[PDB]
Amino acid sequence: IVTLTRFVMEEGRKARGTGEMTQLLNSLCTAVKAISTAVRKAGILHLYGIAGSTNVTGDQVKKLDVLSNDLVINVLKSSFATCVLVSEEDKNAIIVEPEKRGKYVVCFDPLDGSSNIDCLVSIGTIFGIYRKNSTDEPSEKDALQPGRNLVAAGYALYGSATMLVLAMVNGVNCFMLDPAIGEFILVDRDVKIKKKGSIYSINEGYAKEFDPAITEYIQRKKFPPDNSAPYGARYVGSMVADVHRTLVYGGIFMYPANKKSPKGKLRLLYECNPMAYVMEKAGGLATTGKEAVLDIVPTDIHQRAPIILGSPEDVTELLEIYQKHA
Amino acid sequence: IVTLTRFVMEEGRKARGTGEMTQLLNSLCTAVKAISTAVRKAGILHLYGIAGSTNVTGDQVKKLDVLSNDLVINVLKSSFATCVLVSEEDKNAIIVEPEKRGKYVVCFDPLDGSSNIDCLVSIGTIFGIYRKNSTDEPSEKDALQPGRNLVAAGYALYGSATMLVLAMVNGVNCFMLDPAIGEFILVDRDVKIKKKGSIYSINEGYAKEFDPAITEYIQRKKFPPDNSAPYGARYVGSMVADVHRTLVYGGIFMYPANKKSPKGKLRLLYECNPMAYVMEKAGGLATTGKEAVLDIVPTDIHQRAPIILGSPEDVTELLEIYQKHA
Amino acid sequence: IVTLTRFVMEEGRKARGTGEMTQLLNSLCTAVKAISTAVRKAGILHLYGIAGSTNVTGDQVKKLDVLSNDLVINVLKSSFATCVLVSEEDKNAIIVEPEKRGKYVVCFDPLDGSSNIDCLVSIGTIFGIYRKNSTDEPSEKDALQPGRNLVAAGYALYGSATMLVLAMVNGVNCFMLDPAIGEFILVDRDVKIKKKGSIYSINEGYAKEFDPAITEYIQRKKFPPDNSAPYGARYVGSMVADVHRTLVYGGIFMYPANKKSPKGKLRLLYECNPMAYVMEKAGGLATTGKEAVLDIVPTDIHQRAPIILGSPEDVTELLEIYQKHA
Amino acid sequence: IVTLTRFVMEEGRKARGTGEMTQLLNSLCTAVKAISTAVRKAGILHLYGIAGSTNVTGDQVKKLDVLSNDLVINVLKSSFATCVLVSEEDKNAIIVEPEKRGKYVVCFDPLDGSSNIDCLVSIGTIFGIYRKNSTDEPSEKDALQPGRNLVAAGYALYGSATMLVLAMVNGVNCFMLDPAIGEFILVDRDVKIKKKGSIYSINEGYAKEFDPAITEYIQRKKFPPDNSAPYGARYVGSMVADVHRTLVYGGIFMYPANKKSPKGKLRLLYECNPMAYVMEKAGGLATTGKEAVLDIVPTDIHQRAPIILGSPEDVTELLEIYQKHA
Ligand SMILES: Nc1ncnc2c1ncn2[C@@H]1O[C@H](COP(=O)(O)O)[C@@H](O)[C@H]1O
Ligand SMILES: Nc1ncnc2c1ncn2[C@@H]1O[C@H](COP(=O)(O)O)[C@@H](O)[C@H]1O
Ligand SMILES: Nc1ncnc2c1ncn2[C@@H]1O[C@H](COP(=O)(O)O)[C@@H](O)[C@H]1O
Ligand SMILES: Nc1ncnc2c1ncn2[C@@H]1O[C@H](COP(=O)(O)O)[C@@H](O)[C@H]1O
Ligand SMILES: O=P(O)(O)OC[C@H]1O[C@](O)(CO)[C@@H](O)[C@@H]1O
Ligand SMILES: O=P(O)(O)OC[C@H]1O[C@](O)(CO)[C@@H](O)[C@@H]1O
Ligand SMILES: O=P(O)(O)OC[C@H]1O[C@](O)(CO)[C@@H](O)[C@@H]1O
Ligand SMILES: O=P(O)(O)OC[C@H]1O[C@](O)(CO)[C@@H](O)[C@@H]1O
Ligand SMILES: [Mn+2]
Ligand SMILES: [Mn+2]
Ligand SMILES: [Mn+2]
Ligand SMILES: [Mn+2]
Ligand SMILES: [Mn+2]
Ligand SMILES: [Mn+2]
Ligand SMILES: [Mn+2]
Ligand SMILES: [Mn+2]
Ligand SMILES: [Mn+2]
Ligand SMILES: [Mn+2]
Ligand SMILES: [Mn+2]
Ligand SMILES: [Mn+2]
Secondary structure: OOEHHHHHHHHHHHHOOOOHHHHHHHHHHHHHHHHHHHHHOOOOOOOOOEEEEEOOOOOEEEHHHHHHHHHHHHHHHHOOOEEEEEEOOOOOOEEOOHHHEEEEEEEEEEEEOHHHOOOOOOEEEEEEEEEOOOOOOOOHHHHOOOHHHOOEEEEEEEOOOEEEEEEEOOEEEEEEEEOOOOEEEEEEOOOOOOOOOOEEEOOHHHHHHOOHHHHHHHHHHHOOOOOOOOOEEOEOOOHHHHHHHHHHHOOEEEEOOEOOEOOOOOEHHHHHHHHHHHHHHOOOEEEOOOOEHHHOOOOOOOOEOOEEEEOHHHHHHHHHHHHHOO | OOEHHHHHHHHHHHHOOOOHHHHHHHHHHHHHHHHHHHHHOOOOOOOOOEEEEEOOOOOEEEHHHHHHHHHHHHHHHHOOOEEEEEEOOOOOOEEOOHHHEEEEEEEEEEEEOHHHOOOOOOEEEEEEEEEOOOOOOOOHHHHOOOHHHOOEEEEEEEOOOEEEEEEEOOEEEEEEEEOOOOEEEEEEOOOOOOOOOOEEEOOHHHHHHOOHHHHHHHHHHHOOOOOOOOOEEOEOOOHHHHHHHHHHHOOEEEEOOEOOEOOOOOEHHHHHHHHHHHHHHOOOEEEOOOOEHHHOOOOOOOOEOOEEEEOHHHHHHHHHHHHHOO | OOEHHHHHHHHHHHHOOOOHHHHHHHHHHHHHHHHHHHHHOOOOOOOOOEEEEEOOOOOEEEHHHHHHHHHHHHHHHHOOOEEEEEEOOOOOOEEOOHHHEOOEEEEEEEEEOHHHOOOOOOEEEEEEEEEOOOOOOOOHHHHOOOHHHOOEEEEEEEOOOEEEEEEEOOEEEEEEEEOOOOEEEEEEOOOOOOOOOOEEEOOHHHHHHOOHHHHHHHHHHHOOOOOOOOOEEOEOOOHHHHHHHHHHHOOEEEEOOEOOEOOOOOEHHHHHHHHHHHHHHOOOEEEOOOOEHHHOOOOOOOOEOOEEEEOHHHHHHHHHHHHHOO | OOEHHHHHHHHHHHHOOOOHHHHHHHHHHHHHHHHHHHHHOOOOOOOOOEEEEEOOOOOEEEHHHHHHHHHHHHHHHHOOOEEEEEEOOOOOOEEOOHHHEEEEEEEEEEEEOHHHOOOOOOEEEEEEEEEOOOOOOOOHHHHOOOHHHOOEEEEEEEOOOEEEEEEEOOEEEEEEEEOOOOEEEEEEOOOOOOOOOOEEEOOHHHHHHOOHHHHHHHHHHHOOOOOOOOOEEOEOOOHHHHHHHHHHHOOEEEEOOEOOEOOOOOEHHHHHHHHHHHHHHOOOEEEOOOOEHHHOOOOOOOOEOOEEEEOHHHHHHHHHHHHHOO
8 A cells, every 4th residue: 555655755754855865765676676576587587606706895796796786876876865885896985976966875785695696595685874974075984974873774685575674763664575566565564573582593603613602692592591492593694584584573683703703794884784773773682792783983884793683682681691701 | 498398298208108297287387376476475465474273283374374275286186187185284185076186196385484484584385296006096095105106396485586496207407487477497407416515404493302413413513523614504494495505505404303303393295205305316315314204104194204304425424423323 | 777767857857846746757657557567467357347337528437447546546646746636537626635735736547448448459548747826725727727738748558568658848758667677667768750650540430420621631541632652540449559659650640529529529638638748749739620739728627629639741731621621 | 267278178178189289279378478578568678670571471570570480489399289380470381390290280470460569559479270181291281271170279469468369169268368477367258259249440541442342331331321320440450459359349350352452461371260260269250252261272371361350240241242242
């Protein structure tokens, strides 16, 4: 009954804004439908495989990585809503040409879940949007803001259905892509996560690298001291799918620092911050183990951060173990 | 270039068959496209939620469970290829009315991955097909054959794209649904699994219930005795998605017996056997820990079995630990 | 490469407008995709047949008439771009509720070609858009402006492909709906009609009712005095399809006054004016036989007018015959 | 509820056939969906325009002509149901390679309505199917049978929706393509044309070339001697669209001989015969003016014939005028 565009317009209708945000999200939706279309038949389009280079954080580049990067960059330029673009796929920020320049900075991972592409598991797109603040010429530094400054963030999940989850100041809403008329339609309004869940999600292949707090925490999930039933384990291996399930079912998702990676793996600007902002707008928590993800001031557009997120009593329980081992 | 129908006809073209198998798979494809269509927009169709009963193995029944069960049963009847139908959703086998009766028995899970429906993770449909052997009137007993007797088995995966994986006597092929013309198109021919992989997939929330062989096996994945890199962990929580990844990337998927479930959870007829047959046709192995899944003679259409499957050196390694603890 | 939204924004980008027009056309596109979707499978949705009433001009109301009317009205309200709506399906103008009120008046035929629905011939949607001028409370009178005041007009054609043809002050462009990603994509830029064509389009079943100018004109098409080849006849029987072909191939389309209908059949506000404006922006002409369609000041939202349109040398030839018989 | 495949199988189920016909129509449906898909977005695929040659009857070849010809030929080969193929696009019959040879001869117009492609009016595909009779090696002569020998004929109409109309010995049924699941679904069962209609359909641009019977007949449609209301005129200019409307609304469609074309324009094998067979199975009539289309023994695969078809009292009325002028 309500499309994403309708919803957002009937909203900024309040914020009394200039409709730029609305253009920005309209454009992104177009990118997102196009990626979704290609993804649901990638093998028929021969879109599996590498594109033959390595990106800034050292990921081998897949064909969908390239295709989805070009779609997002292009639609964002043509929106007239943006001035600085940070993409996981590009070493440096992309400044938008003056004539198409708009007020927003957008950090995004055009296709998240690379390792899961060829086995047809859920993958997604992640974005976070900042208002340019400085009056300087637009530059890479306009992307170096803490997540606490986000005006909007969320992700497209190409899962069993394609969902656009969009968090802004007042709350989180889910919009499902109807493939027939190619519109995103509101299906979940003002989403809130459960206070406590019963699923934990981490790659246990890193057991030998985990610090003692994560180690103790996982052990308590398997052998609860109060004799409750042990938590269920889930780890899809695509951040967007695992975080989405954490949102709608509750529980906790972890990609902590470990002995080989003092700052974890996941990227602060375009993986960790958008998901922490979604989680916080749903009443959840997102921490590194020692500080709120959203309060970290980045110094590098490609910097990494540990992230633990989801239901606040689950995350709090893990915080108390870190504090304990501090 | 090659659709599933073309492929199968150009095949039985050899087996010199009566084209019944081809009708059977044509019909199933129609069910599968219809379920795929509903699934990619389930929330817009209001198809999330329970249907308000409990099935034979004790699963709470979801709306998609019902919809997908009715589609599969209906298309299979109308195929003229079948005589006995076993569905996870129905307490008893369904005998097909004489006028539509054909020679095949079909065991199927019309929608697998229930727990993952509402969080939009991959779900699927699983099927295995037997030739009726007895000359008796068709009855439930015609479904009580070991998996070694399968003539065809496989599954539809509603993941990032919709894939139909179809194993028959000569090998395994993957066909991707092209949503545009609504045909399944051949994308992977004569699939073979790697001899050894580097991903393990099990719900570790059951740690406290695992027997000593599974326990030792998981510990070796995390701390390899030969100092290699530890295996990666993946557990999507839908059998079809986890098995599919095991197929195309190699490694091992486990749902073993445990202290509460001497026969594991997954159902022999319509979960374990179709996947073991796929795996064996790809050169992989599928065991309970003590015997080949495909050799078990069922006594109950809803009976459970432990299953460990995937790359033969991974499964063999786990067999040797069981033997050791025997 | 260029969607309708992109195109229109990169345009008003010039007119330096408030983006209201852009919202208006975005919304309309959503209506249009939805109608297109229903239309391409109307029989499967049981959408053929009457809805069981008679409209203001006396048309028996079809199911698609109702469905398409509700979609257009709804999306136009929710656009915040409109204040007065005139629809062929509603006796009176619909005033938009203050909170959703915008500056534009929109006259539209939500589904044109009724007689052709059940035989699956091309049908369409027609619209014309006026700026509210008065400062009075919005009322029916704001729709009573001559076509010369249009700021935008055009039509969606549900033909072999779905095309959105959009005329504004600077020219006419065609955008084709890509069903896959559900976006309208620019396919024909700055369309101009040929100066002279070689197809005439009129219902000759009305021969006995035609005035002497139309009669002489048709006879000259069949027996050209200069011995050229006779014009080809085409009459699809849906105004949108016949006018569209007149646009892209040139020639003339006629629905003149006749002995039973001094003002023809087609409705001035939402059939004749939008098509005359398109034609004039393409360099064509649109007349009643005695005056320019676009200069008629309506007194009735449902009033009829004769219309002759297309290539200027064809229309001019017919004007000269009227003048001759004057 | 009933797909084309289901319907046809539940039919030959009676004729007790070998399922070859069913394979043949399955294959054709796949061609037809593929052409439909391309057609609904032809401009986005750049598929408008000529392919740069002239075909046997002298038509300039369009891109869709080529694409649709290759799809039909390919799917028909791979069906194992055919041995000789006649296409409007190929000078000579195509003999199928022994290994894929089946018992049927198929004459088809892979894309009918060329002149209407670029203006997005309805176009279609026409087919007629004969059993090979001789025991000779298959050759062009196996296509030279009268239409009275057809076992099946009909057409796909790419109009406002895509319809497959299929006539066989017992009657005519319509199946609508559901774009969502890509199946043709039964929407009109055992179609019969009205005995008398009230629409005439002919290109009147040929007035100066019509014989006296056609001339008198058209004049009576415009000035009925019994004072009834004059017939409505319709002429879409694509045979498939005009014939389809004649079927579902009744009336008459004419492409007669004229002074320049003693045998009319339309091709006997793959335009006239399939449509005459459909019409006769619906209780209608199809004549040249002097003999039944279906009884003409062709001598040339590309030969032309006059055709007048539709409601039997309309066609009969025109027959009586020919007899009168004989
Ligand atoms: N459609 C909208 N929904 C919610 N907030 C909006 C919207 N548009 C603008 N805003 C907020 O108000 C400010 C001005 O918005 P705008 O100028 O319309 O991009 C932005 O920084 C947003 O934080
Ligand atoms: N299309 C096919 N592809 C592969 N094997 C087939 C096919 N059709 C039949 N068979 C095999 O040959 C036997 C006869 O097949 P049918 O009678 O055509 O169902 C069956 O039991 C199958 O095991
Ligand atoms: N996207 C656009 N393309 C072309 N003209 C526009 C556009 N937006 C506005 N205009 C024109 O400029 C005026 C202000 O437009 P707006 O206020 O944006 O609706 C309108 O009356 C239009 O005639
Ligand atoms: N599915 C069917 N529906 C109607 N008639 C059929 C069908 N299959 C076969 N026939 C008729 O019976 C004969 C044998 O059909 P078949 O051998 O199945 O192609 C053909 O020449 C057809 O005229
Ligand atoms: O294989 P790992 O080390 O568990 O990493 C998986 C993670 O990496 C990512 O693919 C991004 O690199 C995430 O989507 C996911 O959460
Ligand atoms: O939550 P658990 O106990 O790990 O069970 C998950 C398994 O159950 C199933 O949903 C079937 O019941 C499988 O698809 C999946 O492999
Ligand atoms: O049947 P007639 O009198 O030729 O009218 C056909 C005309 O009527 C309309 O359906 C609108 O009423 C137009 O789309 C078309 O041009
Ligand atoms: O332009 P004409 O001479 O009326 O011919 C139109 C006819 O030609 C065809 O395009 C086939 O050549 C038919 O589809 C249609 O009935
Ligand atoms: Mn990456
Ligand atoms: Mn990522
Ligand atoms: Mn990425
Ligand atoms: Mn279940
Ligand atoms: Mn299951
Ligand atoms: Mn199930
Ligand atoms: Mn009407
Ligand atoms: Mn109309
Ligand atoms: Mn109308
Ligand atoms: Mn031609
Ligand atoms: Mn033709
Ligand atoms: Mn043709």
